[PDB]
Amino acid sequence: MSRRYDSRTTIFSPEGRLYQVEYAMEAIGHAGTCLGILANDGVLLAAERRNIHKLLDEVFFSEKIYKLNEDMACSVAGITSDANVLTNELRLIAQRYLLQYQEPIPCEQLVTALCDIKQAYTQFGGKRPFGVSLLYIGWDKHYGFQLYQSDPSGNYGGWKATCIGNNSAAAVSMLKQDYKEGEMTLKSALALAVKVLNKTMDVSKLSAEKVEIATLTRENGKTVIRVLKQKEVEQLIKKHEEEEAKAER
Amino acid sequence: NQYDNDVTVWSPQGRIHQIEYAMEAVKQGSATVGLKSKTHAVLVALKRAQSELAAHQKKILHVDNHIGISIAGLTADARLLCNFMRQECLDSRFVFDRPLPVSRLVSLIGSKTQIPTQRYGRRPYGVGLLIAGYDDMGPHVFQTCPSANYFDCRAMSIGARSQSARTYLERHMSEFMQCNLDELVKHGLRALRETLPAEQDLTTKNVSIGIVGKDLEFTIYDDDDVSPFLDGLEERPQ
Amino acid sequence: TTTLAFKFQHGVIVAADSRATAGPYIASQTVKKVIEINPYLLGTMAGGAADCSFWERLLARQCRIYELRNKERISVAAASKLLANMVYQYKGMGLSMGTMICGWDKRGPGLYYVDSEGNRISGTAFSVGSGSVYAFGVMDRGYSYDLQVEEAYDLARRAIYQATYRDAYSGGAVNLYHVREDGWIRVSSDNVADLHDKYTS
Amino acid sequence: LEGRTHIFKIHARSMSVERDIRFELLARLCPNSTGAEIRSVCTEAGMFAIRARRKIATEKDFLEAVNKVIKSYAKFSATPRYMTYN
Amino acid sequence: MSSIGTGYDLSASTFSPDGRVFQVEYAMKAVENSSTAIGIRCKDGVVFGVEKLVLSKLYEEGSNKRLFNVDRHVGMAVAGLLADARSLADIAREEASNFRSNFGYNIPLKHLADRVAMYVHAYTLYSAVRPFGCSFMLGSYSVNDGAQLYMIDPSGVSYGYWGCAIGKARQAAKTEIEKLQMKEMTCRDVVKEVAKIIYIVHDEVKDKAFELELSWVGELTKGRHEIVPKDVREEAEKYAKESLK
Amino acid sequence: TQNPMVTGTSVLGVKFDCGVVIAADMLGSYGSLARFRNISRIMRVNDSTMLGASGDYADFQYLKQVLGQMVIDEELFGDGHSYSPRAIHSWLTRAMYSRRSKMNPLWNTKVIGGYAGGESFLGYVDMLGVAYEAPSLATGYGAYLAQPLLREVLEKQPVLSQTEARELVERCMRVLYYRDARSYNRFQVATVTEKGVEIEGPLSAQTNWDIAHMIS
Amino acid sequence: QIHSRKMNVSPDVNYEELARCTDDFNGAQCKAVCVEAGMIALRRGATELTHEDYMEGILEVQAKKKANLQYYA
Amino acid sequence: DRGVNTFSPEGRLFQVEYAIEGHKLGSTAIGIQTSEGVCLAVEKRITSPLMEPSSIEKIVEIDAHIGCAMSGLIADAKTLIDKARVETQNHWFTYNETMTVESVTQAVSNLALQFGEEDADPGAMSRPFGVALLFGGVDEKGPQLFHMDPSGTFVQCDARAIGSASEGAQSSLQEVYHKSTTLKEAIKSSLIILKQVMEEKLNATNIELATVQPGQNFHMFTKEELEEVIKDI
Amino acid sequence: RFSPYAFNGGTVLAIAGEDFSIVASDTRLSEGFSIHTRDSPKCYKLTDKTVIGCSGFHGDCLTLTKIIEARLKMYKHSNNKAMTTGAIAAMLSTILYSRRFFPYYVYNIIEGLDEEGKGAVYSFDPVGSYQRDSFKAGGSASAMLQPLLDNQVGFKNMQNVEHVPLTLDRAMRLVKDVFISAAERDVYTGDALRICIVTKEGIREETVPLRKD
Amino acid sequence: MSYDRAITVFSPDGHLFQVEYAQEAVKKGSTAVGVRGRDIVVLGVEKKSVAKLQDERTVRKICALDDNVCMAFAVVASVSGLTADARIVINRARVECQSHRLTVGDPVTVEYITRYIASLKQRYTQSNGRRPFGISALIVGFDFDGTPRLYQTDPSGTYHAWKANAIGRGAKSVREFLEKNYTDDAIETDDLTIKLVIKALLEVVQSGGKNIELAVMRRDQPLKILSPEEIEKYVAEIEKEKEENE
């Protein structure tokens, strides 16, 4: 009975991939734009707010911008379901590290603890992997500003600028074209991120209901984690929108 | 078939074929005969080995100072069960300090063997055991199946081509009861040889005996005193 | 700083000196015995006092190191024997204690001597001893001991120390078991009686 | 194990390759091989041989052909699943 | 159905649109294969009559016996596979032994029967294990609870009976009980009756050959589950033989 | 030696064995500190049909051993294929329960006298409430080991295998003496006999108090 | 007993003993075991089947593919 | 589908029949008991000179006077050897003297077959190991060679071979090797038999020999010793 | 030594003398648990083979627990090691018990007196805390030096020539045993009834009861 | 746990499936070469797939298990980094290295780590409902001796020491070119050993200094992972040496 039902999706394939991670990889792509860019005084995240109605409570800070610690923040590409359990667990881990070390946790240290758990599901157990890929942004003492990406088995890569989600190839190439390895400041860095989100997304003027942008900025020796409000976001939209207008001419 | 995919797989008749199929494994094992009198319990066994230029490792195992076993079937599994029995026999000697009852010990094997046969995704143990033991109610020679049922016999033969040997056991069934130690061992040898072809007649080298009784504790003769029982040859009685 | 297994370092060897003794120091329970045991040919140790306790911890030390040395084909050091004993014994503590073993082997950084006691003390010194009456002994010995003494030269040193020690000491039914350890070998120089050496020297 | 050596000897008769190639050496180098697999070894031996531009197979081609068979071919082979049913 | 690799007989967590559980049912067909075990309630005890299967020519008494003592005053007769019966004997005997220790009075059959049935029933629910392939009777005499007869099947039901049969002949054998007045009747007379029912029901293809074993637990044994004397067995055997002719 | 503080105590139980029987007098009366809660208590247990045991010291502690012995016997008898309670089996088993409790710094004190008849041998055994088994000639239990036993041993020294009758006068004599030397006694005492019939222990029977002597 | 009549057999061999050893047989198989034992019997030179031929007979009809000696014993 | 746990109508388990085949896949090892001592010979069979030949091992120590050559999956055996090291020294703590060839071999063999693929504890095997071990040493009793199988059948031998040449070699040993053949001659017998399964000729970088002889502990033969037996084959 | 609290006392004094292949073990013939001696009969000594004779004394509760265990360890040793019980049995058992009794202090001195299964005679002495040693004199109990001395003076012959100018024979050891027991009663007041000396050989078990003098 | 469903079951081919599936995944790509020197052992991986926008400083594909033990890993597919799979073996190995150094006062040897890799693969095999990692690791390190070592493991758990080995994209092809480059001078001069790793990596696909990352260990001193800027200078000098010999 039991093995027969087990589709043997936990088996290795000869090529050297796990079927589940590959199927999870597709779950991230269906889902919205999450991009992170490095800048030289702070670092910023731009994520697609997918909760647009005219009747919204806003009981959470945001449903995609999560402050994991009091020195880290993250954005989401994938499924909201996986994102909710995961986001809580990310908080206990970030917070315990903060207790022991008392310095901001590396973005690299944060993806690795979770990775064991992701891997565990895929290889054995017959448990689904998490449907979200997370872009963590932070500043840690050792390297300065950093961005880390995690995948559905916890495969990690340090990136200056990266994007996952819907029209992931388009967003990352475009951003590669203008910016290559940390050529811009915090001000300009928000204007590129919204611009990329603009092209990728179906609404080609955006509002603050369509985008939600979060900044993590190092001020007076301490990491400030702030989700920017709708008001700040409109200013950033008008700056990119105007830059696009000149382009044509 | 698919009355034997797992040991939970029933046949419409109402039988698990894997437990039955586990008995066919006992037939692959080496011939062992179990006989009793009124003072001894005697086990006559066939030892085989891959090197006959070397002494053959015993097929009689130690369980108690008056209990010995002879295995027919799976070698690892028989030893595996043996350890549960050994632990209990030696424990029985500490606590109860009687010379432990063959009927008592054997039922406890019945609870453990039932566990995998009851359990999905597992194999039964396909080993048939003949135990000689002497308690203060006299000898008993018991047969335990690959299932969990026991027979208290006066004589039994489980193993390879065991039918040939039973033909002898059926014929001198009355005799077993009266015997002394010597007489029990000569009959078991005459039985043992029958399993095998007409033109093969045993050597002491591939015969191990486990002798149990009233006048003795536990002694295993591998060639030690094997030669006089073997004497007085009788070759394949039909 | 105390007897019952004691060692002092030289370049050429270490001196291994020990007592044969049974029970507490008030009476023997035998006369014939050698409590000296060879756990590995790396060196010899043996104590007394709380008898089960010394034998137990050394037996663990002996198990771990010997398996690691023998299988790996890499020789274990003074430092390794000491670390095993230390880690084990604090854990086991509360189940009687009194281990007094002296660890020797020659290492990459040269010859190393660590003294292992049951408190959890791990010491290198001129001469150290763990057990009981050598505590007095380390005083006279240090004077008559060079940093590097030869093996032959060291044998003569033991004979004089002892010969005065028997006169001062009032413990009977002992032998001085003398071993020199030339590294990862152990050989027994002589097993001379404490009563004999006072006459000789 | 003895039988695999006999499949080499019967196959060699069909071929016009050396008898200075030890039939046994091939048999030990690839044990747990079915009848089809021993004929693919001969076949492979020939593939290396055509590329080199030889009319006759060599022992060099042969050795290589068995070590590729034991490692690679095992994964594809029919036997683990069919033997479980049998 | 019976030949399959998923569910049906692999499981018992499965239901058909009828509602059936096939595995639990296959376990029932298993109890049917061997000869009959009957146990008759009297207002004074229980008398059993069991066919004890003769599977060889080198038999001794008690060999492959189906009579067990659960408690001092409870007897247990099994029918169907003996492999499953040995494990069931250990579990029943254990629930009774602890009961005596704690309560200090003779285990009520109504309680013991509920606990073993729950255990059989836990396996029938599960698809993780198969359920026992035998059916059993527990029968008892006490003056703290009266004479009780209970029956537990492979499904996990416990209900009291005043005369029961398990095994191949049970539909025929049960009919012979309706003929007899057995609710009020000495355990001495009922032994004569269980013996005659068995001899007639047996035929050479339910099983090759049997050895008659009758057991007491009544006014005669004084509330002890014991095996009947050599005398008792033979007169009851004789009456079985005379009625057979 | 240590013994727990006892509240309900059983004291003086003699036992001497004759051929295929033993005679015992044990008090039927268990004082709890001061008050005689049960003058009717039974220190005698039935392991099986040809065994009996009688115990002294803390009465409470005796009941703990009875249940463990009871549950083991219940499973083992009735079947009697080759397994049942046997004379050796009860003695050793009961010793081990006592040993188990000896390992802990509090032990359950009862000192027991087993008379059994097993598969071929008639046994008279002594079991301690810390463990130990042996065959015995005559043994006392609780208070009997210090106070009367030596005068009972002295009568036994010419004839060690005497009759029931000779034992019966000694035991009947011993209660007038019990009252005289020790305090937590009653003169309603139980006569227990273990024989091949079973273990019989009829109710408390009495005879003279006799502490009315004053003649010098 | 029916089958035996068709070929020729010893009275030292019957099915009852084989039935006692293992119950892993059926009526179609019982015919097959008698027919199998006869092939060996015939191969040797015999005008009968004997106890040896039958005893081998049960082993042969059931497959092997490497057999046993000290693989199980 | 059908499981693998099942017994076949042949009267053997599937998993186990596969495990014997696993023994057959690897490299050949010869263990000969002589009464002058016990020699274990194994083929390196290197295909590259960049390898360091010392560190290709297939003789590992169970004990300090028992050596073991192993055959079939090299990796699968290694775990059994890891557990064996802990038992031999453990035996020294309890008995106060060193373990025998017989005691160690029966204890590892219990673990060899335990397999229940589903509904069995993760601290117990799902499948048996396909390794045959040859435990060869001389101990308190004298020279003993014991052979262990993946079927968990242990037997005492004087000459045993396992690996690809296992049936062929074992027959061939019985012929040359007897107890009227001395220890050095056992080393010559093993070398000849070794060559069919080997891809090349015998060399001192293509054999590894170790002999445990009375009154001595386990010695791993040095390059000179390997070369003296190479000269005369 | 220690004054009985941890476990019950049961008195008794053990003397042991080793010769070359004959070893006498003596302890008093009594079972005690209480200040009085229950019965002269005892099962303090238990034989496992003619090769080995063990004596556990003192506290009776200790005596039964370890002695049976020793029979179990013997059985295990013959099976696995393939060396029959003897010296080898003896070293192994003393470690496991001496851990068991020594946190809650040891009140039994078990003495394995045997021959090895390869030969050579050993007489083994535990304090109560694990040590095993071979001896030619042994004194064991609370009075763990009261017998020791006689065996040191008479057997070893260190400043002595009037028990033997060499070393004792079998005939000589048995003569000395009766004498030693008569002497013990005088000094040690914790005995009643009889003293039992068992002489253990590889070829003869001997038992003798000797009245308390 | 509740999961005990089969992922590995033994084959009549005398193998374990996962192990073989893993072995081909190191045939097909992720070139990792190691050479052993005479003061220093250097291991190198090619690919972190630096597409000129990714970070190079914080990315590790060579991880220090200890300060005298380091491993470089490989096994690839369409899911190209199996960094996750490695990351488990890396974390358990890291504690075990440190642990061995607490207990045994000799600095932990590569030979200990290699047996530990052979048992981790195996343990995962025997446990129900569990599967072997696909990794192959080039375990580099220093013993008690202070002798440089390079050992290589396979996905089954069998280890050999080797002076110089290459795995990935034709293990034997990269190694046989590299075989000429392994000379007595090359092993002696430390600087020449750093070039030997880089020189092998270049055979499969040439150029890139960011794609190539290599880590160096000298004596029992801590792992030093070299800057990509150091690599670029080195590939340029290697390319001219090829023209000189040839």
From TrEMBL, chain G:
Location relative to the cell: Cytoplasm; Nucleus
Domain of life where this protein originates: Eukaryota
Subunit annotation: Component of the 19S proteasome regulatory particle complex. The 26S proteasome consists of a 20S core particle (CP) and two 19S regulatory subunits (RP). The regulatory particle is made of a lid composed of 9 subunits, a base containing 6 ATPases including PSMC3 and few additional components. Interacts with PAAF1.
Function: Component of the 26S proteasome, a multiprotein complex involved in the ATP-dependent degradation of ubiquitinated proteins. This complex plays a key role in the maintenance of protein homeostasis by removing misfolded or damaged proteins, which could impair cellular functions, and by removing proteins whose functions are no longer required. Therefore, the proteasome participates in numerous cellular processes, including cell cycle progression, apoptosis, or DNA damage repair.
Family that this chain belongs to: Belongs to the AAA ATPase family.
Protein name: 26S proteasome regulatory subunit 6A
Lineage start: Eukaryota, Metazoa, Chordata, Craniata, Vertebrata
Gene symbol of the encoding locus: Psmc3
Positions spanned in the full protein: 370 to 442 of 442
